[PDB]
Amino acid sequence: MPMQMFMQVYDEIQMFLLEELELKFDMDPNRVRYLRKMMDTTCLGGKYNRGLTVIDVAESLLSDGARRKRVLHDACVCGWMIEFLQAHYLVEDDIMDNSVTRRGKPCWYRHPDVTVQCAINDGLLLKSWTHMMAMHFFADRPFLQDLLCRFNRVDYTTAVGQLYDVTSMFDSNKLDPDVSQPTTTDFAEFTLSNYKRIVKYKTAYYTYLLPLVMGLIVSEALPTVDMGVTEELAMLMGEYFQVQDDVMDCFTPPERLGKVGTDIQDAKCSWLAVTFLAKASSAQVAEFKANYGSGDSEKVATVRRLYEEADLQGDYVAYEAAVAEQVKELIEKLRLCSPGFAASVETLWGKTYKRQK
Amino acid sequence: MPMQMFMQVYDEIQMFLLEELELKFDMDPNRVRYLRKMMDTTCLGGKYNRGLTVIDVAESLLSDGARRKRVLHDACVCGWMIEFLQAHYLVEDDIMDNSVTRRGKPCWYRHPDVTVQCAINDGLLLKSWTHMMAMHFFADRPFLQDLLCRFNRVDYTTAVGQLYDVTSMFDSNKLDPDVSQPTTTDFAEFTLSNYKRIVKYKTAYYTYLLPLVMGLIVSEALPTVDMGVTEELAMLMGEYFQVQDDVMDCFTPPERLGKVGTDIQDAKCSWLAVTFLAKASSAQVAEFKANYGSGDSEKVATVRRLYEEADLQGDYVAYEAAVAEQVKELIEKLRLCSPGFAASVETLWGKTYKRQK
Ligand SMILES: CCCCCCCCCn1cc[n+](CC(O)(P(=O)(O)O)P(=O)(O)O)c1
Ligand SMILES: CCCCCCCCCn1cc[n+](CC(O)(P(=O)(O)O)P(=O)(O)O)c1
Ligand SMILES: [Mg+2]
Ligand SMILES: [Mg+2]
Ligand SMILES: [Mg+2]
Ligand SMILES: [Mg+2]
Ligand SMILES: [Mg+2]
Ligand SMILES: [Mg+2]
């Protein structure tokens, strides 16, 4: 059922937005139809991990079934708010990362009828919809200001995180708008510390912390949990989710992965790249340097090979276990004063640990 | 004076933002310096008409010099919020219109050390800065929810406007993501009505209504003015402003304007394009259709020529006249009940009417 009503409120939101376009922006049915397709293709098809979480927290915490209905609905709107924020990111990320496929279909900007320019602006419309939906449905909620501050910080922090990711293959000392510069040939920026920073901000926040917080907000229970504990947790699960994407991006088939991995070509600061570079010998490192950051498929075939070659899967299992115990400890601190919350945090974790997704 | 204090608070905003990056986002000095360049290069160098209006309205309406200061400072923050919104729109716009030059200098995405993928994100950071500064300075302010609502509506309206603009070369009946299509060969969509709509939503709202509103809010005088009248005035002055843009985009020399015009090449729905097509003969219309929407400079020179041929500069003057007496009428209807607002509106008009920029 959670999914049942989630989809129902999707329909609501779609109706209100599209109809509002119709009436108040002088929109013809064609463009209106365009945007319905855009919205279904970018927003739907996922597993709604972040959205559902928000409901799940709300329902755990709500502990006159009108209050039940109000929280549940709000939670669903918040859920879609996060899902549309994510859709906005992916539309724009795929463009920035020059990706081919997402979710099993082609990236939005790679549809035959969607120009790159229009995709950038469709990206922006998606972000704007989060605000429009929030303002409509929470217009007379006491928490609306706090929700919109929080949400905007996250989205800002996500963009800062993007700045890190997108500038990780340039030696940060040569960073200047006025003077051009090429892919780093010593990679001395590739470092776990740098990697951790990029992920914290580009992923952790809008993926793990924001769904938890929104669910608490609609529940009027945010002060009841230990935030410090919650923040540590979100950061941890978030980092471990990005690393999992980094490994899959190299070693899970695009068919099961519903995308094709561009980390090796984009010369990305992926987990496999940093972990290799801190453990590998000199000949391994010199091959790598000569075989990373090039679309060539013999050179791409080399790096992938070279990872397998130096036993990264092993490092990933140790990491995973290190994380998994650290999560278990933290959740138990959290159960002490907030059992209901800790339950739904566990569930979320349960959806992440050793995902094949 | 207004210009001096306006520049003071910029430095205040810049400092708080860049420092917050340093402290709360773990940001190195190189990347901090980058954002300082980007922020100066995109937010500075124009005449700050949108910004300054806010201050002007605010000063006009504030009729214990602490209150004066408070209102003046907020008016400066709001102003920079709109200016930073403008900078956002222009960085993204330039990329979407594939433009060369802006404000006498190269477009942000064209700068030698700025990648297209980085520029897209720098745009987004610009937007995020509007929220951050607002939340910092208006934290404790009663009107902060209202300001952020209104602000986001306008931002959303501006993106919808751009959806119209960007898809004005595609037969709208044939608009389908899943299916490709080329530039219209009949231009049946290039109508005044369609032009009007594009302009209304893409320019009028953030350029005229928004500064007027924000100045009102920080004065705590919004309910004092006829909003219906104010809205007419803004739409009207706004439409005109764009039409003035479209005419310079083809006749004003790039060094006078500080930007090379692309409306012809991109096959845009400009005021010249829709006016011509509604008046021109059969042969005129067919040469147009054979020479519009092409980088080729002989094809471009022909269109240009053809506009002068049809004396579009006569139609413009009549338009201008009609707008100027429509504006004069509305400003008196506003002067009746709110003579302080009316004065500041007339100053704004004063800056638009027969501008050369
Ligand atoms: C508000 C910031 C605006 C700039 C662009 C949004 C940042 C997107 C951050 N992000 C997080 C996850 N992803 C997508 C990927 O995970 P994917 O596997 O989908 O390509 P990645 O490119 O790996 O970060 C993007
Ligand atoms: C909300 C994000 C959507 C993309 C960017 C916002 C739309 C920009 C609105 N706008 C208004 C005026 N301009 C720039 C021009 O006036 P210029 O001629 O200076 O490039 P134009 O592109 O003609 O509208 C952009
Ligand atoms: Mg990316
Ligand atoms: Mg990507
Ligand atoms: Mg990836
Ligand atoms: Mg444009
Ligand atoms: Mg442009
Ligand atoms: Mg123009």
PDB file of C-alpha atoms and ligand atoms in Angstrom, chain A residues 86 88-90 92-94 96-97 99 102 127 155-156 158-160 162 165 202-203 206 242 245-246 249 259 262-263 268, chain B residues 121 124, ligand 1:
ATOM      1  CA  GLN A  86      16.353  13.877  -7.584  1.00  0.00           C
ATOM      2  CA  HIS A  88      16.020  17.401 -11.559  1.00  0.00           C
ATOM      3  CA  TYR A  89      19.578  16.339 -10.561  1.00  0.00           C
ATOM      4  CA  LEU A  90      19.638  13.333 -12.828  1.00  0.00           C
ATOM      5  CA  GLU A  92      21.207  17.785 -15.285  1.00  0.00           C
ATOM      6  CA  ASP A  93      23.857  15.207 -14.172  1.00  0.00           C
ATOM      7  CA  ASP A  94      23.430  13.021 -17.249  1.00  0.00           C
ATOM      8  CA  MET A  96      27.047  17.176 -17.331  1.00  0.00           C
ATOM      9  CA  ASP A  97      28.397  13.570 -17.303  1.00  0.00           C
ATOM     10  CA  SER A  99      25.685   9.822 -20.079  1.00  0.00           C
ATOM     11  CA  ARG A 102      19.390   5.834 -17.325  1.00  0.00           C
ATOM     12  CA  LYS A 127      13.246  21.836  -9.384  1.00  0.00           C
ATOM     13  CA  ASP A 155      19.867  21.544  -2.551  1.00  0.00           C
ATOM     14  CA  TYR A 156      22.602  24.145  -2.153  1.00  0.00           C
ATOM     15  CA  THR A 158      24.134  19.153  -3.287  1.00  0.00           C
ATOM     16  CA  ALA A 159      25.344  21.822  -5.772  1.00  0.00           C
ATOM     17  CA  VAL A 160      28.482  22.526  -3.754  1.00  0.00           C
ATOM     18  CA  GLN A 162      28.725  18.873  -7.567  1.00  0.00           C
ATOM     19  CA  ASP A 165      32.923  16.152  -8.134  1.00  0.00           C
ATOM     20  CA  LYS A 202      26.832  15.488  -3.644  1.00  0.00           C
ATOM     21  CA  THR A 203      24.893  12.484  -2.329  1.00  0.00           C
ATOM     22  CA  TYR A 206      19.724  14.814  -0.325  1.00  0.00           C
ATOM     23  CA  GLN A 242      27.864   6.211  -3.277  1.00  0.00           C
ATOM     24  CA  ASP A 245      27.335   2.966  -7.053  1.00  0.00           C
ATOM     25  CA  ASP A 246      31.042   3.473  -7.835  1.00  0.00           C
ATOM     26  CA  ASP A 249      29.353   1.591 -12.232  1.00  0.00           C
ATOM     27  CA  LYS A 259      22.632   2.802 -17.056  1.00  0.00           C
ATOM     28  CA  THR A 262      31.011   6.711 -17.397  1.00  0.00           C
ATOM     29  CA  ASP A 263      33.391   6.995 -14.366  1.00  0.00           C
ATOM     30  CA  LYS A 268      36.206  10.358 -12.247  1.00  0.00           C
TER      31      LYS A 268
ATOM     32  CA  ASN B 121      26.428  24.113 -12.110  1.00  0.00           C
ATOM     33  CA  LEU B 124      22.751  26.725 -10.182  1.00  0.00           C
TER      34      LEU B 124
HETATM   35  C1  LIG C   1      21.647  21.318  -6.893  1.00  0.00           C
HETATM   36  C2  LIG C   1      22.942  21.000  -7.648  1.00  0.00           C
HETATM   37  C3  LIG C   1      22.861  21.291  -9.156  1.00  0.00           C
HETATM   38  C4  LIG C   1      24.008  20.619  -9.962  1.00  0.00           C
HETATM   39  C5  LIG C   1      23.622  19.209 -10.424  1.00  0.00           C
HETATM   40  C6  LIG C   1      22.934  18.329  -9.343  1.00  0.00           C
HETATM   41  C7  LIG C   1      23.922  17.360  -8.641  1.00  0.00           C
HETATM   42  C8  LIG C   1      23.631  15.840  -8.759  1.00  0.00           C
HETATM   43  C9  LIG C   1      24.375  15.034  -7.657  1.00  0.00           C
HETATM   44  N1  LIG C   1      24.238  13.594  -7.899  1.00  0.00           N
HETATM   45  C10 LIG C   1      24.174  12.627  -6.983  1.00  0.00           C
HETATM   46  C11 LIG C   1      24.024  11.416  -7.639  1.00  0.00           C
HETATM   47  N2  LIG C   1      24.020  11.681  -8.956  1.00  0.00           N
HETATM   48  C12 LIG C   1      23.908  10.774 -10.086  1.00  0.00           C
HETATM   49  C13 LIG C   1      25.043   9.783 -10.173  1.00  0.00           C
HETATM   50  O1  LIG C   1      24.976   8.983  -9.012  1.00  0.00           O
HETATM   51  P1  LIG C   1      24.768   8.696 -11.592  1.00  0.00           P
HETATM   52  O2  LIG C   1      25.171   7.266 -11.256  1.00  0.00           O
HETATM   53  O3  LIG C   1      23.275   8.700 -11.732  1.00  0.00           O
HETATM   54  O4  LIG C   1      25.429   9.107 -12.895  1.00  0.00           O
HETATM   55  P2  LIG C   1      26.774  10.411 -10.257  1.00  0.00           P
HETATM   56  O5  LIG C   1      27.093  11.039 -11.616  1.00  0.00           O
HETATM   57  O6  LIG C   1      27.558   9.114 -10.073  1.00  0.00           O
HETATM   58  O7  LIG C   1      27.043  11.371  -9.088  1.00  0.00           O
HETATM   59  C14 LIG C   1      24.155  13.021  -9.125  1.00  0.00           C
END
